[PDB]
């Protein structure tokens with residue numbers, strides 16, 4: 001979709017910080033440590049996390065909003081694939097994705 005402006009990027013920074021501050025974002029703040037998730041990097045071919053997204057935002061990696069949404073969705077999709085639906089980690093993805101949607105709709 002449409003090219004991101006500098007003003008758009010300030011809004012993306014705001015959304016990212018909101019996610020990083022959320023009480024249920026802690027499993028997603030940094031790349032998964034293999035010691036905390038057996039076989040994680042054998043299961044998940046395209047890992048993603050909020051620190052990697054922050055680095056990409058600061059580097060102006062994103063050209064369009066779809067690319068930012070895609071990386072954010074990877075975080076949630078990876079979590080729900082790796083973990084069972086009754087896992088607390090799965091629930092964190094449920095809560096934080098709903099929050100992301102609220103914030104993304106606000107973003108314009």
Ligand SMILES: CCCNc1cc(-c2ccc3c(ccn3CCCN(C)C)c2)nc(S(C)(=O)=O)n1
Pocket residue numbers: 026027028032033036037038078079080082083089090092
């Ligand atoms: C047994 C299957 C568990 N599945 C998991 C586990 C984790 C996870 C666990 C601990 C964690 C973080 C983040 C910090 N800590 C604590 C510190 C740990 N060390 C010292 C760095 C994530 N994240 C997911 S995830 C990303 O939601 O898919 N799934």
